[PDB]
Amino acid sequence: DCYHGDGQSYRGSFSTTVTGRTCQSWSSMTPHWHQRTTEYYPNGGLTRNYCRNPDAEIRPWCYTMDPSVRWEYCNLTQCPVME
């Protein structure tokens, strides 16, 4: 799977970080409390624990299930140019 540009439009199901950690559910406040929820980002597609870029980051990211690592970029690369 892959994303385009900075990934704001990414709506795939990838959920693993660049270090192999699993993404935290956007509706959960554990292990990390945050405000990136569907209520505050109704158009961000914050579903399950899927990698997303609801803000203005460089690529899709997610809070992680490791209490010691709050958030990380996901292990996704940009889609190649359509030939």
UniProtKB/Swiss-Prot annotation:
Transmembrane segments: none annotated. Residues 1-79 form the Kringle domain. Disulfide-linked to apo-B100. Binds to fibronectin and decorin. Apo(a) is the main constituent of lipoprotein(a) (Lp(a)). It has serine proteinase activity and is able of autoproteolysis. Inhibits tissue-type plasminogen activator 1. Lp(a) may be a ligand for megalin/Gp 330. Belongs to the peptidase S1 family. Plasminogen subfamily. Apo(a) is known to be proteolytically cleaved, leading to the formation of the so-called mini-Lp(a). Apo(a) fragments accumulate in atherosclerotic lesions, where they may promote thrombogenesis. O-glycosylation may limit the extent of proteolytic fragmentation. Homology with plasminogen kringles IV and V is thought to underlie the atherogenicity of the protein, because the fragments are competing with plasminogen for fibrin(ogen) binding. This is Apolipoprotein(a). The chain holds residues 1273 to 1355 of 2040 of the full protein.
